Amino acid sequence: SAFITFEGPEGSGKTTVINEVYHRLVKDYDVIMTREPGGVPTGEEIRKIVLEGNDMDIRTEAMLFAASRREHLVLKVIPALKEGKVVLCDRYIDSSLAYQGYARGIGVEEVRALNEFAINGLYPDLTIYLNVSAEVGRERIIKNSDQEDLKFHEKVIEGYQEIIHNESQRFKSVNADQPLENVVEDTYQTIIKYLEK
Amino acid sequence: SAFITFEGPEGSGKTTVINEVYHRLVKDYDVIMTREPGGVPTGEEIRKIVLEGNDMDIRTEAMLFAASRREHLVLKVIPALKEGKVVLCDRYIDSSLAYQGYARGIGVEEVRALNEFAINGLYPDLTIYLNVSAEVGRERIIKNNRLDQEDLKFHEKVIEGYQEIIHNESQRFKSVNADQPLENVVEDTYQTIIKYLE
Ligand SMILES: Cc1cn([C@H]2CCCN(Cc3cccc(Oc4cccc(C(F)(F)F)c4)c3)C2)c(=O)[nH]c1=O
Incomplete structure (x- = not known):
């Protein structure tokens, strides 16, 4: 079994990457892909409280997303890992x-x-x-589709830069400034190298 | 302003105490009585998930009690404290x-x-x-019938837990002897609060 998460800011090509990588991996591996809360009823109900929120405090929101994360883990991720599956998850703690x-x-x-x-x-x-x-993330967000949004996007990236260099062993960084075909290829090769050892 | 919480296992006479202490304090203080979720919409929605739970993981349950606590604190407790009120809260962090x-x-x-x-x-x-x-708490719970082993043990553990919390902390904690008749429990609690408020 293997629990693999995918992280990145928006404009990193994350959606395309996970979908294309998952498609290739299914051919050879007992693999599942899940998008938190992944249809888990309790998880979806917790998420609805946040989404229906009227100016909800950010900490309440964080706690409810954490409760939803756990329901997804205990009812979907953990049972699949106990079955010996590889689990691809679209977002997680990072x-x-x-x-x-x-x-x-x-x-x-x-x-x-x-x-x-x-x-x-x-x-x-x-x-x-x-x-x-x-800059590449910004152009991808525009290409696919504000000063406050640009600054927030920069803080998310800065945040990931701080995180990645503190847990180096778990983390495998892929150059997402490349065209998406190369990003998909590098991610696939990274995962295969991990799964074969 | 003052934020006062009431803690105890079931059978401690907590409901009677908070209500009777509230009815006495209201004469002289701009005081409110609350508990979580306490009508707060998001808190009420969180409560429904906890009550509809079929063998819900204890950590999910803990996170939901924490999210409800925050909703009740921000939307109900904090605005009343900013108004200079005495907030009596039945159950909190402890x-x-x-x-x-x-x-x-x-x-x-x-x-x-x-x-x-x-x-x-x-x-x-x-x-x-x-x-x-x-033992006193058990007899009060039965009155609200013999209480099963699972419930008795859980009740004993909650008490043990509170004993650990009160000992490893204090300086906010004021312990009232709840083994006394409820009239005395109410009187001691009232006196404790008045001494704090002045
Ligand atoms: C405040 C609190 C109470 N309890 C107990 C006290 C003894 C009674 N039980 C069972 C019970 C009874 C009635 C309603 C109930 O559901 C609640 C109560 C408060 C808050 C919530 C929630 F909004 F957080 F979900 C649910 C639970 C909960 C905890 O286990 N942890 C806490 O943080």
Whole structure:
């Protein structure tokens, strides 16, 4: 079994990468791909409280997303790992840290403690970080589709840069400034190299 | 202003105490009585998920009690404190510590870190602990019939948990002997609060 997460800011090509990588991996591996809360009823119901929120405090939101993360883990991720499957997950604890912790200003130490309570030691075996520069990410966001949004996008990237260099062993960084075909290829090769050892 | 919480296991006479202490304090103080979720929409929605839960993982449950606590603190407790009011709260952080941390076995430190993220430094100015023995509490719970072993043990653990919390802390905790008849429990609690308020 293997628990693989995919991380990156928006404009990193994350959606295209996970989908294309998952498609190639299914041919040879007992692999599943899941997008948190991945249709888990309780997880989806918790998520709805946030989404229906009227000017919801960011900490309440973070705690509800952490509760949803855990329901997804206990009812979907853990049973698939116990069945010996490889699990590809579209976002996980590093997202909460870069977005809620760093970018939204709750604090790194606080969001990490929250994430650690939700995951109870279940860290990914491998995390693919889609390493995009703020400028390439910006052009991809525009190409696919504000000063405050640009600054927030820069803080998310800065947050990921701080995280990645603190847990180097788990993290495998892919150059996401390349065309998406190369980003997909490098990610696939990185995962295969991990799965074959 | 003053933020006063009331803690105790079931059978400590907590409901009677808070209500009777509220009816006495209202004569002289701009005081409110609340509990989580306390009509707060998001808190009420969180409560429904917890009540509809089929063998819900204890950590998910702890995170949901923490999210409800934050909603109730920001939308109800903090605005009343900013108005200069006396806020009496039935159960707060210490309940999660004794129930989720100790009795459920998650770990008091882990549950404390979760609840500190939830409360963001907003600790009660005063916490009344209704100190009941497991045996007196048991007899009160039965009155509301013999209580099964699972319930008796869980009740004993909650008490053990509260004993650990009160000992490893204090300076906000004021313990009231809840083994006394409820009239005396009410009187001691009232006197404790008045001495604090001045
Ligand atoms: C405040 C609190 C209470 N309890 C206990 C106290 C003894 C009674 N139980 C069971 C119970 C009874 C009635 C309603 C209920 O559901 C609640 C109560 C408060 C808050 C929520 C929620 F909004 F957080 F979900 C649900 C639970 C909960 C905990 O285990 N932890 C806490 O943080």
